[PDB]
Design a protein around this motif. Structure first.
Motif, short mmCIF file in Angstrom:
data_model
loop_
_atom_site.label_atom_id
_atom_site.label_comp_id
_atom_site.label_asym_id
_atom_site.label_seq_id
_atom_site.Cartn_x
_atom_site.Cartn_y
_atom_site.Cartn_z
N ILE A 70 0.86 -1.17 0.00
CA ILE A 70 0.00 0.00 0.00
C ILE A 70 0.90 1.22 0.00
CG2 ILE A 70 -1.79 1.28 1.24
CD1 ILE A 70 -2.68 -1.63 2.23
N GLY A 71 0.95 1.98 -1.08
CA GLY A 71 1.84 3.12 -1.15
C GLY A 71 3.10 2.67 -1.83
N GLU A 72 3.94 3.62 -2.11
CA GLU A 72 5.17 3.35 -2.81
C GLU A 72 6.13 2.43 -1.98
OE1 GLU A 72 7.65 6.71 -3.93
OE2 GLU A 72 8.73 5.43 -5.34
N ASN A 73 6.21 2.70 -0.69
CA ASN A 73 7.02 1.90 0.19
C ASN A 73 8.46 1.95 -0.27
OD1 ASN A 73 5.42 0.42 2.43
ND2 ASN A 73 4.11 0.41 0.65
N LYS A 74 8.95 3.14 -0.47
CA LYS A 74 10.31 3.33 -0.90
C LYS A 74 11.35 2.95 0.19
CE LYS A 74 11.96 7.35 -1.20
NZ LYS A 74 12.47 8.72 -1.55
N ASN A 75 10.97 2.94 1.46
CA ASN A 75 11.90 2.57 2.53
C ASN A 75 11.26 1.49 3.38
OD1 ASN A 75 12.01 5.97 2.44
ND2 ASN A 75 13.83 4.88 2.14
N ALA A 76 10.69 0.49 2.71
CA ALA A 76 10.23 -0.67 3.36
C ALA A 76 11.36 -1.51 4.13
CB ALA A 76 9.59 -1.58 2.36
N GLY A 77 11.00 -2.38 5.06
CA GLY A 77 12.01 -3.12 5.77
C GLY A 77 11.35 -3.95 6.83
N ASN A 78 12.18 -4.52 7.69
CA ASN A 78 11.70 -5.21 8.85
C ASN A 78 10.92 -6.42 8.45
OD1 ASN A 78 12.86 -2.96 10.59
ND2 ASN A 78 11.09 -1.96 9.61
N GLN A 79 11.33 -7.04 7.35
CA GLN A 79 10.72 -8.24 6.86
C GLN A 79 9.22 -8.18 6.56
OE1 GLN A 79 13.04 -8.16 9.80
NE2 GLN A 79 14.42 -8.26 7.98
N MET A 80 8.74 -6.99 6.16
CA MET A 80 7.32 -6.74 5.82
C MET A 80 7.00 -6.96 4.32
SD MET A 80 5.36 -5.70 8.42
CE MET A 80 4.10 -4.54 7.89
N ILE A 81 7.94 -6.60 3.44
CA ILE A 81 7.69 -6.55 2.01
C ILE A 81 8.93 -7.01 1.26
CG2 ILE A 81 7.05 -5.07 0.08
CD1 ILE A 81 5.68 -3.18 2.04
N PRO A 82 8.79 -7.95 0.32
CA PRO A 82 9.94 -8.28 -0.53
C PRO A 82 10.47 -7.07 -1.28
CG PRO A 82 8.13 -9.83 -0.90
CD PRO A 82 7.58 -8.77 0.01
N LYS A 83 11.77 -7.08 -1.57
CA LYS A 83 12.48 -5.98 -2.19
C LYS A 83 13.23 -6.49 -3.42
CE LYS A 83 13.88 -4.01 1.89
NZ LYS A 83 14.49 -3.01 2.75
N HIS A 84 13.24 -5.68 -4.48
CA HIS A 84 13.97 -5.98 -5.68
C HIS A 84 15.42 -5.65 -5.38
CE1 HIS A 84 10.54 -6.35 -8.49
NE2 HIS A 84 9.99 -5.32 -7.86
N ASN A 85 16.28 -6.02 -6.31
CA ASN A 85 17.74 -5.79 -6.17
C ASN A 85 18.09 -4.32 -6.01
OD1 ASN A 85 16.93 -8.19 -7.29
ND2 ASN A 85 18.90 -8.61 -8.27
N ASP A 86 17.35 -3.41 -6.66
CA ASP A 86 17.59 -1.97 -6.43
C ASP A 86 17.17 -1.39 -5.11
OD1 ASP A 86 14.70 -1.54 -6.92
OD2 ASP A 86 15.21 -1.46 -9.07
N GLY A 87 16.55 -2.18 -4.23
CA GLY A 87 15.95 -1.57 -3.08
C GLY A 87 14.43 -1.31 -3.10
#
Length: 416
Positions: A70-87
């Protein structure tokens, strides 16, 4: 006579449900440190056939989830959302798999994808979606009130990973062998002891005893003694080790020799009417902290009381907690509303080549509401906050000063 002789059928005994979970987790840190914010919606499915009738019964299971940010989630973390190689955050993702199961008398064997809750190898269930393990688990209830388990797992898929064999660090499981037993002695006393041997990674044992002591006026005192012993292999991944480490440990997390942790805790809870208070003490010894979750060993393998945003798992760390819990239904104000407040202080933390005396503390509050009746029965809302502070030496070495909020809306729905 047994669990298998009472089987009704593949269809008749089946059960299935979906949990819709909306989550929000943010951590505000001081300047020079990374703020995280993660917002997402999940649907988590669990389907379990019944067992076919006969001397040996057979069925299947399915577990999985699908989610979107939900939202861009540009600084996601804490094992909430998978991340692509770029972050960048993944927009949407899907995970899970199936199992087959067989049952004879009071013993079940399940092979395939599954959520585990062994104290020594426990799936994450405190983020958006569950952590999955793949392998074989045998569960025996041939002695009343005794549960014995034995298993072997070869994949670990953490909540924020798309690959089927990837822990919180993106690394796969080699082979985790697990065993243990849990016993209810009477209604006031029970105990458990479990073992893990994970190839090239670590050996871990857990024990618990739990004793409830009835008092006057619907009151009680409950005492708990819990602990782990962990031996980390020379090639395992750790971060808090002291003593002889390899030049590159700094960078690799590989000590190049065995490191040992013991962590234990004692708790006493007095409960009376609407109200509870707990005191707990927890201490680490050996030449590493309780560096759990770093070797495909279960993100939730932390069955100890001084555990909120920080887990009080530093090298030589001691810690003490006071916790207060109110049930607002028993009190007469709002059924299903509960409040927990706690304060935990940690000290004696060794940070390698810096100090023997670092400290941390955490002030935690959670309010929770669970719907008590009507169409949305068992839906709940959890709002929780941690105000966390630590000495200078235990910032980037662990979490760092933080104000954390977590909010979770869980809507359970029975399919059958």
């Amino acid at each position: 006579e047994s669990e298998q002789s009472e089987a009704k059928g593949f269809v008749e005994d089946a059960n299935g449900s979906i949990l819709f979970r909306t989550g929000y987790l943010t951590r505000d840190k001081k300047q020079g440190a990374k703020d995280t914010s993660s917002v997402a919606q999940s649907a988590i499915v669990s389907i379990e056939s019944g067992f076919t009738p006969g001397i040996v019964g057979f069925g299947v299971g399915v577990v999985g989830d699908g989610s979107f940010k939900i939202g861009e989630n540009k600084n996601a973390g804490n094992q909430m959302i998978p991340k692509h190689n770029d972050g960048s955050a993944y927009d949407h993702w899907a995970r899970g798999g199936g199992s087959v199961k067989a049952r004879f008398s009071n013993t079940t064997v399940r092979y395939g994808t599954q959520v585990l809750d062994l104290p020594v190898l426990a799936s994450n269930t405190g983020r958006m979606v569950p952590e999955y393990f793949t392998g074989t688990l045998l569960t025996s209830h041939e002695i009343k009130n005794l549960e014995v388990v034995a298993g072997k797992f070869t994949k670990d898929q953490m909540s924020d990973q798309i690959n089927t064999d990837a822990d919180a660090s993106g690394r796969g499981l080699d082979r985790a062998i697990v065993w243990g037993a849990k016993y209810k002695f009477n209604d006031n006393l029970n105990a458990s002891y479990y073992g893990l041997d994970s190839k090239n990674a670590l050996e871990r044992h857990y024990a618990n005893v739990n004793f409830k002591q009835p008092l006057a006026n619907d009151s009680s005192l409950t005492y708990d003694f819990s602990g782990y012993h962990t031996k980390f292999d020379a090639n395992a991944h750790t971060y808090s080790a002291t003593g002889t480490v390899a030049p590159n440990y700094a960078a690799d997390g590989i000590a190049g020799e065995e490191k040992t942790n013991n962590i234990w805790a004692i708790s006493g809870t007095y409960a009376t009417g609407p109200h509870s208070v707990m005191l707990a003490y927890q201490q680490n010894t050996g030449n590493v902290g309780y560096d759990y979750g770093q070797n495909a060993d279960g993100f939730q393998s932390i069955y100890l009381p001084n555990s909120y945003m920080s887990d009080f798992i530093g090298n030589h760390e001691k810690s003490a907690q006071i916790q207060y819990n109110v049930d607002f239904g028993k009190l007469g104000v709002l059924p299903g509303l509960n409040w927990t407040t706690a304060f935990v202080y940690g000290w004696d933390i060794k940070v390698r080549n810096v100090t023997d005396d670092a400290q941390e503390r955490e002030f935690f509050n959670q309010v929770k509401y669970t719907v008590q009746s009507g169409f949305a029965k068992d839906a709940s809302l959890r709002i929780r906050n941690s105000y966390y502070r630590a000495s200078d030496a235990y910032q980037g070495a662990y979490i760092g000063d933080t104000n954390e909020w977590r909010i979770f809306l869980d809507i359970p729905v029975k399919l059958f």
